[model samples]
Structures are given as C-alpha cells and as structure tokens.
Target: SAVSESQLKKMVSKYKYRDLTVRETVNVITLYKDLKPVLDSYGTGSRELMNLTGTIPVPYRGNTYNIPICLWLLDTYPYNPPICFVKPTSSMTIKTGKHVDANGKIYLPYLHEWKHPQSDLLGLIQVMIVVFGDEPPVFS
Candidate 1:
C-alpha cells in the first residue's frame, strides 16, 4: 500500500537512538550496529560481538588489510570515545610511519574534534578509512 507522508510519521516515532545515552549502552550499540555493515564491506566485523570486540579489516588503496581491529565502548559514548586498536598477526609487517602506530592505534583530529550530536561513528570510521592514504601499507 502507498503510505502518505503523514501516515509514515504516524507509523514511527524513533525506532533507534534519539537523544542517545539512556543510562544504557543504547548509543554505543546503535552506533556500532549501523557501522557494522558499512565497515563489513571492508571486513571490519561480522557484526558479531564480544560485548564490543569484533573482527575488523581496514582498506587502503585497492587492498584490504585483514587485521583485527578490536574495540571497547563505554556507556558514556557520544561523550567519550571508544578505545580501538589494530591487532596485526605475527606474519604481518607494519609500514614505517603510518597512521596506525606500532601498537596498532591510529589518531585523527576527528577524535579531538569530537562533540556529541555533532560527531558520529560513521564519520569516525569513514575518516579512518580516508586517512589511511592511497599508498596503503607495504608489508614484505
């Protein structure tokens, strides 16, 4: 049936996180949930979880770095950023001077620019993907 604009509005009134933070992990899960598949195309996770940890693969240039990007979200998220790390296997070699450090942590001004209701997980992930650069990484 073709629903009218008014009907659609009447059908819904916040299916997802609205104000964010419900003394709950609402925002975190909502953010991660939306981000899962988008990041999935690049293999960030199976949308699976260990309370927040997931398999993550980063892409740069035309290649995908199949590494584990573990994460942990706090209940205060949207106000406090999550902790992330790139865990590479023993066989993997990290490039010298890359956005991700020897510890597999990356940094971007977005982290500093973060402000609730202004910044989001999608932007954060997109920026991470963008900042990886076109050169990618050289692991020999």
Candidate 2:
C-alpha cells in the first residue's frame, strides 16, 4: 500500500494543518519528531507530548524529576528559547541560583544566545543537564 496524498498533505498544509497553520504545525511537529529519540534516551521511557508542549522526566540529583526541558515556546518560538521550568515536588525546593529561581524559571546561557535560525530545544535540555551537575541547592 502507498501513503495516501491526504496523509502526505498532512505533512504539508495551509494556514492551519486543520485548524493551526500548516507552517507553524510543521515547525512544531518537525522539532518534536527530531527530539523524540533524544528524549526517549534521556527520559525514563516516553515523553508526554502535546500539540505545542513536551515534557520529560530527568533522573537528577537523587530523584526522577519530571522536568520541563523543551519549554518556553511562547508561539514566538524559533525566535526565542522555549521557556523551561523545574517542577519540584512539595518535598523539594528549587534553590535560587544564577540559572534558576524559586518559581523554577531557568535563565540559561544558551537562551542568552538564542538565534531563531540556530538555537534549538535539544541544546536547551543539554544545558539543563550540564547546569544541574552544579545546579542550585534544593532542600528536603
């Protein structure tokens, strides 16, 4: 059997792939597809992916934290780094640091150097892991 034209059309679209702009959907879908493998390896099993957002689990410090890595996509993505936050459990506190805040907002270097043409969500995740190695202190 062959992949139908309709299916192929889904690959490309108009203002909305169905409702959303095909171009925008492409931008979002392509990026998500590209990150699937990376996320699978980095995350526990599978990532909880939505239309525009994707969340994954990161085994950090001493716990499996459900951290938002490919975040900050403010519909203005491809223009700026997606917003990322570290969702800490009630038992954990996101210690304040140069890269993070109590609200779990992250200000990374990659973000500082975001370029619509070059910056990507993958690099953002890597930065999180790198910074987490010496990241903020959390209290139990």
Candidate 3:
C-alpha cells in the first residue's frame, strides 16, 4: 500500500537525533528510506530542493550543469533541503502548492526521493540535500 502524508509527517516528527554520531546518521538514513515512495510520487514537487536558477557549467566538462541536488528533513537536514533562492523583492518561490493530501503540506520538486536498498526498508521522515559543488563535475 502507498504511504499517506500524515503518516510520513508523523514519522518525521517522531524521529530523534541526539548527536552527529555514526549511529545517529545511520538511524536518520533509515528514517529516510521509509518515506521514499511518497516523495517519488511527487515529482516536480521535489525540484524545490535543487534551487537551480538555470543551467550552469561543470568545471571539468564543456557541458552545462544544473544544480546538484538532494532531499533532507526540515529539522535534521536543513542544508540538504531546499534553500529559498527566491528574492524577497520577487514573489515567493517556495510554493505551498502540490500537497500530498488535503492537509495542505507542501512538497518541493528538485529533491531526491529517499531510498535504502541494503535494509529493504523505507523511511518516512528526515529530508535534506547534499550539494557537492557549485557546478556539475565541480573540481575540488
């Protein structure tokens, strides 16, 4: 069966992260796996996490690059989640549109859906993004 938004939210709300220890990170990862399918279903909604204005160049390659992106929970994965790039002078870019259910929660499009293959289980809470470089193939 498919997961519901409230169920997912509950999972996220219940999550506990005491420290940055390896065990904590692993548990967080586990929680993420629980929420993957619901996130995947909301495709464009995920894009909010990408925060790309347009295509940019990757340092190593001639090809242009878009933002490198991922999804993270609001509480645990702040840096990994969508960063509001919309200018204050401009309209709000972080849309409250595309709710999973009638509850009115919002979803971003650029974020990646969570998944954990090793455990064969999925997570429902904890979203974030992990941007590696300014451009694709970004050189260290």
Candidate 4:
C-alpha cells in the first residue's frame, strides 16, 4: 500500500469565492483529505462561505484521535491564519487549556505569525498535534 497522487484537481476549481489560490487549496487538500470543502453559512449574515469542515488526525498518549475541527478560509487566507476551532462531539468535553477555549476555539503562535510558503496547513496541524499531545484538548 502506498500513497498516491492527490485527486484535488476538481477541488482547485470548486471554491472560487475563496481567497486562496488553486495552488494553496491543493496544498490543503493533500494534508486533510478527510475534510469536506463546502460552501456553508457561518458567522454573521446568511451568505455562503467556503471552508474545510471535518476531523483532523491528532495523536496523543500512544493513541490517535480524529479530532473534529473547522477551518474557515477567509478573504485574507495564507496571509492570515484561517479561523480554526475544535468542533467537539456530543460525547466530548473541551478541556479548556491555554491554547483551546471552552468554545473549542484554538490559539497558537503559528496563527499569529501566519505566512504562506514558509507556513501552511500541514505545519499548522503538526504544531496542533504536538501541543495537543502535551495537553489533551478534549476529554470523555
């Protein structure tokens, strides 16, 4: 079994309203293939917005967890960090830490210094996994 080429060609042409370029979207799709890119309404107004919604693979304590999360790709994506949150399930409780809040919002230094090329989704998630490994973001 081996990893094959990404089938994100269609994804590149999907969300036009999204600020991210085709190149940027392709990079994101490769890392979290499980996430669903949808044009759904969020925040204020009923306008449909583009974002990646689903779970991200995060491992901790010798076990891997599929942590449900949402990534909102705003107009200034790549230049600025996406609006990320930990969407916990009904059976989960957010372990409000310095990085994660009661509302499941995430805060990281990487987000503050968000810059494309040098920074990307994979790097962001890598940092998240590392931090969550040290401090579990959710509990049963």
Candidate 5:
C-alpha cells in the first residue's frame, strides 16, 4: 500500500501541535510525503529519532517556569506517533528563572545548535518546526 495525499492532508489537519501556520503545515506535510518511501521500507520496525529541541515556559500559580524540550518520533503513521518532552539532560539543570515580557518572547540560547542525536543508526529522519506560544504554558 502507498501513502496518499488525502491521508497526509488529514494527518496535517489533526496535528496536535496547533501553532503551525499554513506555510509550516504545508512544509510538514511535504516532508512527510517525501519520507514515505523510507518509512515504508522499514515495515514494522521500530526506531528512535530526535525531531526538534526548544525552550518553552509554563506558568503555575502566577509564577512562570521554563523548560527545554526535545521532540522525538518513534514510528510511522497508524502505528506509533511522535512524542515531545523535556530532554533529561537539560530538564533537571534548567529552571524557570523569570517571567517573559508582555511580548511573550524569551531567547533560546541553544536553539541553533540543535543537531540530530548521534544514536539514530537506522537513519530515522525528521523535520523540525519551531512555534511560539502567546501565553505562558497553554497553546496561546
């Protein structure tokens, strides 16, 4: 069986990450379509791959907290889905030090330095999409 455009479009429509602009969504769909062959080649195999990394802040009881997250994709569609979480390495060390300004902007010092994790041997591929939040935690 082959992946279809309608399936990809439907998947894009249901994407959990809501911040994607139309352009960003299109880019993601295109990447997924482009990778279909590789994903199909693997069949039912499992692999781990780092997709993206970034810093986000969450507010709790009037206090704002910051977290650095590493997004990972585990398997192909209809089988396993991508997961996002704070990287274990930076999660513990980094703290929610301050509140973001009214503009809701905080610089991620390590943003550009993110690279594919060295452990991906099965050549698991991913596309990175960065989005911003208006409020502290919730998808604003």
Candidate 6:
C-alpha cells in the first residue's frame, strides 16, 4: 500500500529535524503512489528507519521498465540526502555503472552535493529515472 499522510506524520514525529523531509516525503509519495512507507534497519546497527520502497518507471530504448528501488530517509533528511538503492528483482540482474554499483547502492551528484529546499527526494529520483534510462541498473 502507499504511504499515508497519517503514517508519514507518525514516522517523522519521533525525530527532531525532519520538518522538511516530512513535507517532501508527502509530496513524493503523493505523486508516486507505488511507493510504500516501511520500517527497515539501516547503517551500522539494526536501527530501523523509515524508507520508501517501490518502483520507478524508466523508459529505455522504447521500453519502459519498472525499476524497483528503496529510499531510506535518515533523521537528518533534507540536511543530507536519503540513502538510495536500485533493488533488482528476481527476473533481473544488477548492472554496475556510474550511478549504480554491483551491490545496488546509488551515487549521484544530486546526492553528493545535497542541499535542503534545493535538493529533495523527488528531484533526486527524477534524476535517477534519467540516469537509469541511459544505462539501466539492471537487465532482463
């Protein structure tokens, strides 16, 4: 299911510096209905955090593929870019490239040089759609 506004409110309530992230999270989830809000462990320990899990439509060579992905929002979101990944499905394999790695981690200028208000999750994913379209993170 999609991430609900109430769910988002609850998720960000526990944190102190998530005002901007919560707003952008709502914006992103509103447009991308396929994304779901889920709790998953990130970083060094088994610390569960909020993440958006779903697929992005990437048009490549006349074919549009639903590329599965996960965007982990840290407590310091907006201040810092959310951790991004290209999660390949069972029918696909990871294609290591400039934006994606063998392990499915993502790297982008938007992420490296992130700034609040200027850099949001939606913008980053839009860039991902473009980047992945060129050299998709996975192949069928």
Candidate maximizing lDDT = 6
Clashes of each: 1, 7, 29, 0, 0, 0
19-65: candidate 2 lDDT, tens digit per residue: 23223334444544422211111132332212233344445667754
TM-scores of the models, in the order given: 0.53, 0.53, 0.18, 0.79, 0.28, 0.91
Pick the winner on lDDT between candidates 4 and 5.
Answer: 4
How far is 61's C-alpha from truth in model 4 (Å)? 1.7
Q: In angstroms, how far off is 59's CA in candidate 3?
A: 2.1
Candidate 5 residue-wise lDDT, 19-96, digit = tens = 222233234435443222112111234432324344334445566444444434333321233343433242243222
Task: State the TM-score for model 5.
Answer: 0.28
Worst 10 residues of 4 by lDDT: 1-10
Model 4 per-residue lDDT tens digits across residues 85-115? 8887899988898999889999999988898
Q: Pick by TM-score: which candidate is best?
A: 6
Residue 52 C-alpha lDDT in model 5: 35
Count of clashes in candidate 4: 0
Q: Which candidate would rank higher by lDDT, 1 or 2?
A: 2
Q: What is the C-alpha RMSD of each candidate to the true structure, in Å?
A: 10.0, 9.4, 14.5, 4.2, 15.7, 1.7
- Per-residue lDDT of model 1, residues 1-140, tens digit only: 13233432332223233234232233334544422211111135533222233333467556665444554433345576655565555676655455666766655677766777777665666566566544333364
**Whole-model lDDT, model 4:** 0.71
For residues 33-126, what per-residue lDDT tens digits would candidate 3 score against the true structure?
Answer: 3222222212355322111122222233434333222233333343233322211112212222332212223243433442323111112221
Q: Residue 69: error of model 4 in Å?
A: 0.7
Error of 3 at 107 (Å): 10
